[PDB]
C-alpha cells in the first residue's frame, strides 16, 4: 500500500475505537532448545480471571492492536500466568479475541512526553529474522511448530529478539520468511514493501517519533538461495528500502552482511557450480551493503554495520573455537534439501541429541540454531561493536 493513503480523519477514527482484547501467552513446553514445541494459555490477572488490554485494532488487509499497557506489564502477566520453572520457557505473547484468532502483534503506543531515547526495535528482513509473519500467513502450518519454534526458522529466538531482550525493548517484526515453500502463502515481495507496510501501521500509532526506533535490516539470503534473484535487483530493492526509511525520518539503523549460505547443509545436495554462483552473489551484495552503510554515515545517520558474513566464516571454518561442535551437519535428521520438509516434524540425529542443539551451528539444512542467533546478538552487543552510538535507556 502507502502511508499517504491513510487520511487524518481515518487516523482519528481508528484511534478513537477503544475496544479490548485478550493475550495469548506462548511458552516452550520442553526444557531445552532441542525441543521446539510450544503451547499457550490466556493471560490472567493476579486473581486468575482473564487479563485484558484496552486499545484499538488496525489492519491494511493482518491486524495489529495498539494499547497503552506496557510490554513489560504484559510479559509479567504471561510469566505469572504460566508459571514456567524450566530455563528455556522463551515466552512470547500476542493479542487474540478467541482461540480461532491468529497471533496478532501488540504495539504499545508511546507517551506524549518523549526525548531521544530508543523505545523500540523494528525489524525488516527474511527467514533469518522472521518471528511469525509467514507462520501466521500459513495458518501455523509452515514451518511446522513441533520442530521449528513457533514461526521462527530455528529452534528458538532469532538475533533481533536477543538484542531486544538485552536492551529490554519491544521488538516489532516486519521480516517475512522467504524460505523454500513460502511462495504458496504470499507472493514474493521486496524488503522495500516491508518498509511500506511498516510505515502504514506506524501512521496509526500515537506520538510516534521514527528517530526513536532502532531499525534492523538484513535481506537477500532467500532471494539469492531460493529465488535466483540477480544482484542488481536486490541492490535496487535494498537501496530503495533505505531511501524510503530515511525519507520517513529513520535515524538509527543496524545493518548486517549476509552469511555465506552455501556452507549450509542443504548445499551437500548442490553442484559446485551452484555453490560458486550463489556464493558470488553474496560476496557482491555484501559489498553493496557496506557501501550503503558508509554512505548513510557520511550523510549523518546512526548506522552500525555488523559483519555477520565474517563471523559465519569463522563459525563454519572452526566451530570449536567459538563454543560449537558441528558446523557441517543439520542437527535435525533431514538428509536432503526439500521445501516440503518444513511441513513435517523431524527428530534430532543421535549425534545432535548427544551434544545438544546448542552445540550445532545449523538446525535444519538451511537455518542457524538459536545458539548461533544468540552468539550474533552477543557479538553485536559487545563494547566497541557500535551499539554505543544509539541512545539506550538504562535499567537498574
Ligand atoms: Br532449517
User: In total, how many domains does the chain have?
Assistant: 2
Cα(179) to centroid of ligand 1, in Å?
9
**CA 6 to chain CA mean position, Å:** 26
Look at residues 85, 86, 121 and name the one whose alpha carbon lies nearest to residue 198: 121
- Asked whether residue 101 falls in the same domain as residue 141, the answer is no
The label of the residue with cell 559465519 reads 312
- Asked whether residue 111 falls in the same domain as residue 255, the answer is no
Look at residues 210, 233, 213 and name the one whose alpha carbon lies nearest to residue 223: 233
Cα(281) to centroid of ligand 1, in Å?
21
Q: How far apart are CA 171 and CA 38, in angstroms?
A: 20
Count CB-CB contacts under 10 A for residue 147.
Answer: 22
Cα(384) to centroid of ligand 1, in Å?
32
Cα(152) to centroid of ligand 1, in Å?
10
Cα(24) to centroid of ligand 1, in Å?
26
Cα(153) to centroid of ligand 1, in Å?
6
Cα(264) to centroid of ligand 1, in Å?
9
- Asked whether residue 203 falls in the same domain as residue 60, the answer is no
Non-local (6+) Cβ contacts of 16 within 8 A are: 56
Q: How far apart are CA 134 and CA 376, in angstroms?
A: 23
Cα(295) to centroid of ligand 1, in Å?
34
- Asked whether residue 52 falls in the same domain as residue 169, the answer is no
Q: How far apart are CA 235 and CA 217, in angstroms?
A: 13
- Asked whether residue 269 falls in the same domain as residue 298, the answer is yes
**CA 384 to chain CA mean position, Å:** 24
CA distances from 178 to 1, 32, 158 (A): 20, 27, 15
- Asked whether residue 181 falls in the same domain as residue 278, the answer is yes
Cα(348) to centroid of ligand 1, in Å?
12
CA distances from 106 to 23, 77, 135 (A): 9, 14, 17
- Asked whether residue 63 falls in the same domain as residue 201, the answer is no
Cα(237) to centroid of ligand 1, in Å?
25
Say if CB 314 and CB 322 are below 8 A apart: yes
Q: Which of 84, 116, 148 is the last residue of a domain?
A: 116
Cα(102) to centroid of ligand 1, in Å?
23
The pairing of strands 64-67 and 106-108 is parallel
Look at residues 97, 164, 89, 103 and name the one whose alpha carbon lies nearest to residue 129: 164
Domain that holds residue 360: 117-396
Cα(127) to centroid of ligand 1, in Å?
10
**Can you list the positions of beta strands (E) in 290-362?**
302-306, 326-330, 360-362
Cα(369) to centroid of ligand 1, in Å?
8
Q: Which helix (H) or strand (E) holds 122?
A: strand 120-124
Non-local (6+) Cβ contacts of 9 within 8 A are: none
Cα(101) to centroid of ligand 1, in Å?
27
- Asked whether residue 341 falls in the same domain as residue 380, the answer is yes
Resolution value (Å, 1 decimal)? 2.1
| Angle at alpha carbon of residue 167, lines to 108 and 59, rounded to 5° | 25
- Asked whether residue 108 falls in the same domain as residue 133, the answer is no
DSSP assignments along 168-234, one per residue:
T--EEE------TTGGGGS----HHHHHHHHHHHHHHSSS--GGGEEEEE---HHHHHTS---HHHH
Cα(364) to centroid of ligand 1, in Å?
3
Cα(167) to centroid of ligand 1, in Å?
27
The C-alpha R_g of the chain, in whole angstroms, comes to 20
Cα dihedral value 159, 359, 308, 368, nearest 10 = -60
- Angle, helices 308-317 vs 370-381, to 10°: value is 130
Cα(first)–Cα(last) distance of the chain, in Å? 42
Beta bridge partners of 171: 121
The pairing of strands 213-217 and 52-58 is unpaired
Say if CB 68 and CB 54 are below 8 A apart: yes
The label of the residue with cell 538485552 reads 166
Phi-psi region of 52 (alpha: psi -120 to 50; beta: other; left: phi over 0): beta
Q: How many residues comprise the chain?
A: 396
- Asked whether residue 91 falls in the same domain as residue 186, the answer is no
Cα(109) to centroid of ligand 1, in Å?
34
Cα(341) to centroid of ligand 1, in Å?
9
Cα(22) to centroid of ligand 1, in Å?
32
Cell of 60: 491494511
Q: Which of 78, 98, 116 is the last residue of a domain?
A: 116
Cα(80) to centroid of ligand 1, in Å?
32
Q: How far apart are CA 324 and CA 20, in angstroms?
A: 46
Look at residues 15, 89, 2, 97 and name the one whose alpha carbon lies nearest to residue 58: 15
Cα(197) to centroid of ligand 1, in Å?
27
Cα(258) to centroid of ligand 1, in Å?
16
Say if CB 46 and CB 25 are below 8 A apart: no
- Asked whether residue 174 falls in the same domain as residue 112, the answer is no
Count CB-CB contacts under 10 A for residue 83.
Answer: 9
Say if CB 65 and CB 104 are below 8 A apart: yes
Q: Which of 89, 116, 143 is the last residue of a domain?
A: 116
Cα(314) to centroid of ligand 1, in Å?
20
Cα(83) to centroid of ligand 1, in Å?
30
**Can you list the positions of beta strands (E) in 1-119?**
19-28, 38-42, 52-58, 64-67, 92-96, 106-108
Cα(334) to centroid of ligand 1, in Å?
9
DSSP assignments along 314-330, one per residue:
HHHH-GGGGT-SEEEEE
Q: Is 285 helix (H, G, I), strand (E, B) or coil?
A: helix
Question: Widest CA span of the chain, in angstroms?
Answer: 63
- Asked whether residue 240 falls in the same domain as residue 334, the answer is yes
Omega before 143 within 30 of 0, i.e. cis: yes
Cα(338) to centroid of ligand 1, in Å?
11
Sign of CA dihedral 246, 248, 253, 258: negative
Phi-psi region of 98 (alpha: psi -120 to 50; beta: other; left: phi over 0): beta
| Angle at alpha carbon of residue 281, lines to 276 and 284, rounded to 5° | 120
Q: How far apart are CA 375 and CA 177, in angstroms?
A: 21
Amino acid at each position: 500500500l502507502s502511508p499517504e493513503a491513510i487520511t487524518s480523519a481515518q487516523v482519528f477514527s481508528t484511534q478513537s475505537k477503544e475496544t479490548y482484547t485478550y493475550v495469548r501467552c506462548w511458552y516452550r513446553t520442553g526444557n531445552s532448545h532441542d525441543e521446539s514445541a510450544t503451547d499457550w494459555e490466556w493471560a490472567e490477572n493476579p486473581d486468575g480471571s482473564y487479563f485484558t488490554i484496552d486499545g484499538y485494532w488496525w489492519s491494511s488487509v493482518k491486524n495489529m492492536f495498539y494499547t497503552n499497557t506496557s510490554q513489560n506489564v504484559i510479559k509479567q502477566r504471561c510469566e505469572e500466568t504460566l508459571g514456567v520453572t524450566h530455563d528455556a520457557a522463551d515466552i512470547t505473547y500476542f493479542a487474540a479475541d478467541n482461540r480461532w484468532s491468529y497471533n496478532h502483534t501488540i504495539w504499545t503506543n508511546d507517551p506524549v512526553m518523549q526525548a531521544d531515547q530508543i523505545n523500540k526495535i523494528v525489524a525488516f528482513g527474511d527467514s533469518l529474522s522472521d518471528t511469525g509473519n509467514i507462520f501466521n500467513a500459513a495458518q501455523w502450518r509452515f514451518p511446522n511448530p513441533d520442530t521449528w519454534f513457533l514461526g521462527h526458522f530455528s529452534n528458538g529466538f532469532v538475533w533481533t529478539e536477543y538484542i531486544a531482550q538485552a536492551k529490554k525493548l519491544p521488538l516489532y517484526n516486519w521480516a517475512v520468511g522467504g524460505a523454500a515453500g513460502s511462495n504458496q502463502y504470499v507472493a514474493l515481495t521486496g524488503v522495500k514493501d516491508q518498509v511500506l507496510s511498516y510505515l502504514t501501521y506506524a501512521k496509526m500509532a500515537k506520538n510516534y517519533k521514527p528517530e526513536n526506533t532502532l531499525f534492523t535490516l538484513e535481506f537477500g539470503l532467500n532471494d539469492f538461495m531460493n529465488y535466483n534473484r540477480e544482484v542488481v535487483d536486490v541492490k535496487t530493492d535494498f537501496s530503495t528500502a533505505l531511501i524510503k526509511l530515511t525519507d520517513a525520518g529513520a535515524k538509527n539503523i543496524m545493518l548486517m552482511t549476509l552469511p555465506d549460505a552455501t556452507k549450509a547443509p542443504q548445499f551437500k545436495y548442490s553442484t559446485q557450480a551452484e555453490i560458486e554462483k550463489v556464493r558470488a552473489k553474496i560476496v557482491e551484495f555484501n559489498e553493496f551493503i557496506k557501501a550503503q552503510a558508509a554512505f548513510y554515515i557520511i550523510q549523518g545517520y546512526n548506522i552500525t554495520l555488523y559483519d555477520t558474513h565474517g563471523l559465519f566464516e569463522q563459525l563454519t571454518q572452526n566451530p570449536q573455537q567459538h563454543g560449537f561442535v558441528n558446523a557441517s551437519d543439520a542437527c535435525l535428521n533431514i538428509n536432503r534439501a526439500s521445501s516440503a520438509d518444513y511441513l513435517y516434524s523431524h527428530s534430532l540425529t543421535n549425534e545432535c541429541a548427544t551434544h545438544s542443539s546448542d552445540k550445532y551451528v545449523f538446525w535444519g539444512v538451511t537455518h542457524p540454531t538459536t545458539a548461533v542467533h544468540k552468539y550474533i546478538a552477543e557479538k553485536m552487543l559487545a563494547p566497541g561493536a557500535g551499539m554505543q552510538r544509539f541512545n539506550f535507556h538504562h535499567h537498574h
